[PDB]
Subunit: 254 residues, 4 copies
């Protein structure tokens, strides 16, 4: 009888009530993990939880705005109470970037983008580390973007923050290695979600982006789910400090 | 919970020992029909014996990847026996000898570039038409961490592994219209015969561990899961990608 | 010729080490340079030393973290020289060795602010002036830590990697204005900033072995590439990071 | 005169990028021996640079021939007393062709001339640079090393390979005080690249595709090479510098 690869593991996935995070949450649970979903809006949490509990998956949810230290610490407490520990963290939140010239980006946009996109995952990782230590180790996946390698103009704050996350991933992987905590990164290309709607709103704009990105199709949320589940599993025990691009062939880096 | 490579047919070059053998075993555990192959018939024999004795759908044939005739025959062998080809894993390398660039002969450069760079390109060429007939396929090329972080003393080998990064990219772009995916595995230090020089003395092992900033050396099976995943339709949105399996050893952003 | 003849350059954090070496070189290559840092006394001494070498260098206080200091830096240069051609952004927070587990939220905020946000806003403040000159050159100082972080400095590491992203995104954004944006990424240079890594002689030797280098860098080892990148001889180089690290591993 | 009294070999330096490099090095004070496959190209190259008052001489060297490489080194030593700089610039002309149509002969010639030859040419100069207390090597790769276009797979692979050669040589040769760096040009207007710019319609198409405002010229590559060859770049080794006018490459 083939065993579940995340049998008896406990996972937190932030920003997991829609799109990529939701797709990741579902797969981890499909792969045997107890999962706690969260996002900012309680009405988003309930529907995600209802949908996934509808499928017989070990899933519960709570509100957690990753920008709020209270929420982050409460997310960890909820999971530990319910399941007795934490083995996996997937950090997936990002601030919706407004398209504009760097000359029109305000200081408040910079502050919010760096806070939510860069500081928050660092502090969210800090919050889970002691619990992961108790279990003998763990796995962290940070979600950046192809934009880290290939920036488009108009999204400078967002671009910078996703590149920063390549460093956060590398530096945490080295620091947390003695605790047997692996730290990897998912860098999606253009995935069809509400987040990216501006870029596939029109069938003309979808075709224009495909030609620009040198891709045959846009990604779906579930195209990101398998690699994250693999990375979170003991089968990937010799992979740490690694960013995996899931971009359908769009240019990234060697 | 399905076999992720059910009904798929896979060639793995250089699959009678170490990483290649472990990839072969895992592809077959995940449902694939696998043809294993290497230069020496004796290794092919016991490779097949071992894996068939575990109940895996595996057969073998001799294939030196430097020989056009062997490459073509490997493909013919799989087509005849299974009806087509879905997956190629190119794993062969020339065993490099430690030496200065001042003592590397022209014949060493030629052989290294032939076997390590040209042969995977021609092997892939040999499978493309068969993958086209199945509606697409997956290719995985085995490079090395050396491609990003070369050690002195192995310059021809180092150059060939970096070249393979380029081969993976250029082929992924070329073959995308045929729905063929091309990705690359870049292992760090894995305990095999190939690498024995770097881990035969326990003092050398702990020395390498500190040099490479790792807590342990890899085993062959540490490479199998990612390759089996990349060869699957669960990775349909991953092509042109090199994945490093080096236990944290530095590579690149 | 004098490759930067009649060009006007701002270098932030330019009263010691790398930033001072850059200021000296730009000036030697013909440029009018305005040097600046937080402390007036540091500014005074840097200016005195360079003017005594007959170079066209004046100073002013500018803490790059303060909006008003950045605006005043530009205003000072525009009043004295008539415009701005070159910005080199060189300031960073001094990093303290410690675990991610001990790094406070306040350390994250300050590091991201001074090391990442400030360069972006300092660039914003020089863009309109560079436009009026027909274009210009921006060089951002990051670090080898951007590519090859060591443990104990995570916030600084993350901020330096962010700067690679900033360089690239700004290069693309400002290309239509004929503004080039490139980045210097130094390896271990012997300055006060890095003194924890070289003041003890046995530590220095240890870092050489670890970093795979034959010697540590000196501030002047960084100055030539920066002055080149600011010249019209580099007019087809933008979006580029150049590592000055004595062969220490970085990237392909 | 940053290169005063230095002796520079530049392969494939009778036209385009190699020629612009040879000119600049000579302008910066170096004695330069230019070379390529054809004597009339060499003679024209040499005549033009000598007419500018530069210390340049020439000789024939096909980089694919062991005897030519060694004789190039002997020629420079005989004339000037030693060798300080090597710039390796030669490449086989690539023609658009699907990987399915690339012959094994094209794979061999491309790996030979683009990868093995630079390595063996460096090997040829190393003992001489040792006698001078060190030296500087620059290898010309391409933006194609990072961002390959379809239809040029062998060339693309060979240019990525040169990134590795730069890195492995820089490490191996550092103890002999020999620095090794790489130039990676974007689209430069030369005969080598004519398929991508000769037609104006094609030029505009490539500019859009590469996200550049202009094509490069050969002299756009000269300064960085001369810099890298100078002692002002003594803390730079193992480094590839892209000269691509903003086209994407890498972080
Ligand atoms: N093309 C792409 O779609 C693409 C490409 C590359 C990278 N990414 C990355 O993928 C992530 C976005 O996911 P997506 O594309 O799947 O978007 P999506 O489908 O729109 O989902 C966004 C999710 O984030 C949650 N969220 C937003 N702000 C939050 C916060 N401050 N704290 C906690 N949760 C928050 C939302 O729920 P609430 O509204 O309830 O908070 C929702 O669950 C980002 O990290 C993004 O950079 C996306
Ligand atoms: N081990 C490591 O630390 C490490 C690290 C990075 C990369 N790699 C890469 O991993 C790959 C395999 O290494 P390994 O460590 O698993 O070696 P291994 O355990 O010694 O196995 C080598 C296999 O290659 C076969 N082989 C050798 N030359 C061949 C050829 N020309 N054609 C067909 N088969 C050939 C051998 O069988 P026959 O002798 O019967 O031909 C054997 O089955 C290589 O590409 C290597 O560069 C290894
Ligand atoms: N090994 C290395 O030294 C190394 C390696 C890689 C990168 N770097 C980068 O090089 C830069 C550091 O230069 P360095 O090593 O030359 O340091 P340094 O010799 O100590 O000089 C630091 C300079 O920065 C000024 N400064 C500090 N904070 C400032 C602020 N907020 N606003 C304006 N000026 C400020 C100082 O003057 P005041 O005290 O008067 O403000 C001083 O002139 C940083 O960007 C660093 O990340 C250095
Ligand atoms: N867009 C571009 O033009 C571009 C972009 C990236 C990289 N590059 C690189 O730039 C380098 C030079 O190309 P280019 O564009 O300057 O070409 P170019 O203007 O056509 O000049 C090529 C030079 O190479 C010589 N040559 C050709 N084969 C040779 C050989 N086997 N041995 C010695 N010399 C040889 C030619 O002289 P003879 O005919 O007399 O031998 C000529 O002097 C190549 O390495 C190429 O890969 C060019």
């Amino acid at each position: 009888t083939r065993r579940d690869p995340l049998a008896n593991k406990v996972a937190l996935v932030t920003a997991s009530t829609d799109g990529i995070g939701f797709a990741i949450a579902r797969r981890l649970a499909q792969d045997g993990a107890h999962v706690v979903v969260s996002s900012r809006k309680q009405q988003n949490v309930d529907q995600a939880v209802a949908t996934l509990q509808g499928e017989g998956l070990s899933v519960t949810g709570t509100v957690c705005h990753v920008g709020k230290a209270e929420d982050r610490e409460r997310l960890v407490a909820t999971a530990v109470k319910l399941h007795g520990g934490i083995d996996i963290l997937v950090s997936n939140a990002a601030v919706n970037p407004f398209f504009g010239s760097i000359m029109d980006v305000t200081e408040e946009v910079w502050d919010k983008t760096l806070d939510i996109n860069v500081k928050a995952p660092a502090l969210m990782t800090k919050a889970v580390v002691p619990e992961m230590e108790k279990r003998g180790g763990g796995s962290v996946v940070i979600v950046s973007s192809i934009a880290a390698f290939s920036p488009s103009p108009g999204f400078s704050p967002y671009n910078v923050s996703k590149t920063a996350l390549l460093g956060l991933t590398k530096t945490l992987a080295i620091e947390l290695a003695p605790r047997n905590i692996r730290v990897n990164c998912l860098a999606p290309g253009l995935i069809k979600t509400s987040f990216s709607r501006m870029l596939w709103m029109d069938k003309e704009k979808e075709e224009s982006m495909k030609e620009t990105l040198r891709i045959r199709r846009l990604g779906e949320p579930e195209d990101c789910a398998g690699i994250v589940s693999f990375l979170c599993s003991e089968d990937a025990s010799y992979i740490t400090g690694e960013t995996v691009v899931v971009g359908g062939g769009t240019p990234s880096r060697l």
